[model samples]
Target: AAVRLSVSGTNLNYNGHHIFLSGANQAWVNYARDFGHNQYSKGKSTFESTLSDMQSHGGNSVRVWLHIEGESTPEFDNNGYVTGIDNTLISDMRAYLHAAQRHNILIFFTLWNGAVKQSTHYRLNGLMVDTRKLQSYIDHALKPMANALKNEKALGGWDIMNEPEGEIKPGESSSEPCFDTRHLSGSGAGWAGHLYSAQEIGRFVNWQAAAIKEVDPGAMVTVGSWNMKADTDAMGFHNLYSDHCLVKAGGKQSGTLSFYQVHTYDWQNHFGNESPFKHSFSNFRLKKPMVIGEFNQEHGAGMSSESMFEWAYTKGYSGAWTWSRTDVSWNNQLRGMQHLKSRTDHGQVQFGL
Candidate 1:
């Protein structure tokens, strides 16, 4: 059974498996207040517990984020300016990778998030790295990350950057804009406001994809997950703008990729307000593999993580991972484990036969 992914006219196979990536993102684990309290305080037991929880719940993958602020091994500055690789952190990650492999879990490692720095508004506005230094950053960060995880069987893939909506190079303009409430609201400058042109952003995505392939030829790769319009007339359709272009262009560049990653949320209301199932189905109609990298029912909304999981999985999506395995528990969204348990049971009964 071959899982064929068509980009343009080129077909790429995932060897042959419907990769269902499920797991929580531990973005704040390195920060003192987060994962430290658990026995996993860099503790093998702590990581093991989380992995067990994911497996029991029918999740095959986890998204682990590397915080730019922490100094676990001190290889870089607070601003994510890397001087060298932190052997200690790398070793810890390797140990974690070993545990994941033991449990047959996959990992999606994100190199950087766009919302770190507050002073420059680069991250918030989505203008974090200048093109001049983008290549160097890729060589430094991704090269080391690829080298380290290239051989890890549990390694699912790498996400080049996260939520690159803010500081893109504007088309035919030099002035930056203040608020482009197309998708999410924030102060975005330069090309961030131009949501219609995918060519500009596509170039950036292509560069990152090329860089990753150069180092880890065999691994899966994706731009950070994106969002699409509920109605074709919606404002924030810019997120999927580039994705549409990439898919339509379809060639070797698009063929190597595995999933068209996107995030879904009940922005103004709860589950009933918007249909997760419908949104996903619509995206899938595009004739490409899809992953709901992030999706959750918001507060005061009527929906359960259980429903979200069952709905998304039965629709032939490649996979989905909730926002945070732990963070959602504190907020109004679904708790990680609770959803995992229900979805796992449903999946087994529905597809196991």
Candidate 2:
């Protein structure tokens, strides 16, 4: 008999018996110190060690951030003017994907991060992008990266963008605000002046979704680092609005998307504690498959990986990848690879349904 895929039922399955997916962010692989200066000196062994640690922690995946065109360096012109992307970066990224596959760890790769320095041009109350030049950028810079990993088995899905908002622009007040102009209580237009309108933001995401599907029809897509509806009130409704708009657009399009990726830091931001279980369960109840693509309980809590894993398993989340694995630890509060080693042994546990 031919295999029949269920259309209206949960498509959850696993290599074994668990619905949980625990993992960490291996951001260093492509965008950190490991790329340019020590490309030759950095042994593939480093990659092996990172993957081994995640595997030991009951983690089935890892989130890797890809370059639009450059490595850790930003793309620029001879006059130092920002130009286009670097194609070579995508080629190097394929190397990391291959390494992840060898370790049996799936990958949730982010195309771009909102926190990057150049995000000023695209800020939309932390949820939208300027669509005027976005399509060209996607076609030129982003399409190549998507095409490179379109067929990798270790690929879990694509986080189209990360924390799409959260920046305080020049002369702007408030760290977290709303999108509607009517909500502005101050002289400035509030989020309205700094970001795209809801309709424009929705169009941007729809454009990206269409762009990704054009390149990799089989790959899943998501917008990362979204908060719950209640939290949406503070951060503005860009994520919530974008998600709803995408679903509406999907109904009109002829493709499939896997899940809505979310990054929750409530444990740290709210109670100064990390509760992956509470956050994960709350996210899952939205009736959509969720990937906690980014999470960090204590910045320097060296052994918090176990708490992350327990949360993923207990709540039956589809997957998760910690905030990061390696980078400059200037503050000592930024978590690093050593933390991954602490929870490595429990890497294979199945999350409860």
Candidate 3:
């Protein structure tokens, strides 16, 4: 009778059958040209038209950002703490969600992407190690926004951060491996020290998860682990984690996260050779459900979406969503966007809150 989605036993359900989520990331799609070459704006189309295009195909879900470029990024203070989510951004979110509901489109809402600007600049570096900084984000931005939109049916779920592990990098801090580009293995980024540890990062993620649930009890939470692989000796600097960092030595955490999420690309990574374009538990293991949150390979339209869905569904992965939209840096934005128009594999996913 109403619109909603939740995690069911190894599958997402609408009180019916299984659900296979298929869509693309719409991150820098809406923004000023200076921002990431305005990947989405080059089309000169509105969000409405964009969703319409996805709908014209068969897209039922999309990976979007709550604090990305056009998503009404928050304003920050000199102390690097978030002040509040802007009123206009709230309006923009509501409108987008409403449109999604009308089109029966689900949203994978990742939070924050600010690395610049005088205000709302993602105060994320060392956030995993710094107590004051962590709480500051929850007390101000996350809790407020969660409380405000907790009741909205448009929320498929909320990612604590897009690839949160990157926020704790050796030279820099996490956003994750993919979302984060500052790997300090060789040069250590010419920096002298690192900011966090596996434990601090784990505790921070637990704390943020609790805070989010406190405000939005119904909000499903997840953290995108960029390539969830362990590091080797040759890497020199050590790598940290919020996911597999669960070696039982963090500050203090008792429960597991909502699920396991991995971000992968076509090539191998410094993190480890996480099998891209496929899903499996042969390497890492967790009690929680798992998902391939992001991937972008330029295979034939059929091979890309169809291949992943086949892999995930048969291999027992919750689901898989691709790297992005018409505004991507690739000449053919359609490369990884097959699911936006079609789901070659009729599969099953997850549901929970």
Candidate 4:
């Protein structure tokens, strides 16, 4: 049966029962080339093994990345316009969706990565800086993928991008305090690509969400925010992905996020009051279902991966998916899943028509 999910007053209702989404970020098998280069097919067993492993541990949801840096997707032309999708992209997603269904897992297909835009990825980066290029991607690549995968039962919907702040450039002269220039980028901090303005980032997410809603109105959508500082009105920070800001940027009424997904690390946690771990989901004052989309045992604010899962469930957040299942050295994804299974409501992922 297909998974029927919805936001029910800051809680994710799966098959009429609100359940905590417990899982990890599979991320990818070979980074950005997974779908475009047929990596998912070439390494079928490895991908399947990860899904099987997640299911075995009672994980019901997982986040997977696509088009990171756009090094291998959304075939581009010399003028930086999107030509189309790679030949293997849709077929690869279909295969992945079916595999995930067998394991009763829902998949969050994140569409882009704003974190790293190297010299080789200039064409993809142009989509962020240039509206025409972004529209080409919408008309060519993004729309095609949404149309093809909209009906998959395991499809949890789209995450506009992963941690867009990694590439967001500061200082754009917006009157809104949330758009404060200083909070925009982590320049000189080893992160790459400080090219996109905050409004451009909003527009990027805005139109994409609007397009996805047009194709599959039932689908859920969100952004993978890097921290609570910018996502919430914590301390002096503010929420930038609000419906007002998104709509203002793209002029699309449907470009808003269905829920909020914020990532936290040890560095963010060090700020005690600003750390998501230190506050309940309600503390952020966001009026939707919020998920801790990316975090690991290592960034659990001194808690183990298992304890972090337990904490999110009891602490009012709708869901919590660990960093990367492939990150075996630090995440302890299995332990987190095992711990989540102990809670009956969160243990079994109920999927139905």
Best by TM-score: 4
TM-score of each: 0.68, 0.65, 0.71, 0.92
lDDT for each residue of candidate 3 in 60-80, tens digit (9 for 90 to 100)? 677776554222445556776
Of the two candidates 2 and 3, the one with more favorable TM-score, higher being better, is 3
Q: Global lDDT for candidate 2?
A: 0.49
RMSD, each candidate, Å? 6.7, 7.3, 6.9, 2.5
Weakest lDDT window of 10 consecutive positions for candidate 1: 3-12
Number of backbone-clashing residue pairs for each candidate, in the order shown: 11, 11, 23, 0
Q: Please give the CA lDDT of all the candidate structures.
A: 0.50, 0.49, 0.53, 0.78
Q: Assess the local accuracy of residue 325 in candidate 2 as a C-alpha lDDT between 0 and 100.
A: 69
* TM-score computed on alpha carbons, candidate 2: 0.65
lDDT of 2 by residue, 2-95 (tens): 2111112223444333244556776655454343333513645767777776655445567766542233433433332334555545545567
Better of 1 and 3 by TM-score: 3
- In model 4, where do residues sit more than 4 Å from their true spots? 1-3, 171-173, 182-190, 268-271, 328-331, 345-353
Residues 64-93 of candidate 4 have per-residue lDDT tens digits of: 988877778878898989899878889888
Off by over 4 Å in 1: 1-15, 31-45, 67-83, 119-129, 166-201, 230-256, 270-276, 280-285, 298-300, 330-353
Q: How many pairs in model 4 have backbone atoms within 3 A of each other, for residues 3 or more apart or on separate chains, i.e. clashes?
A: 0
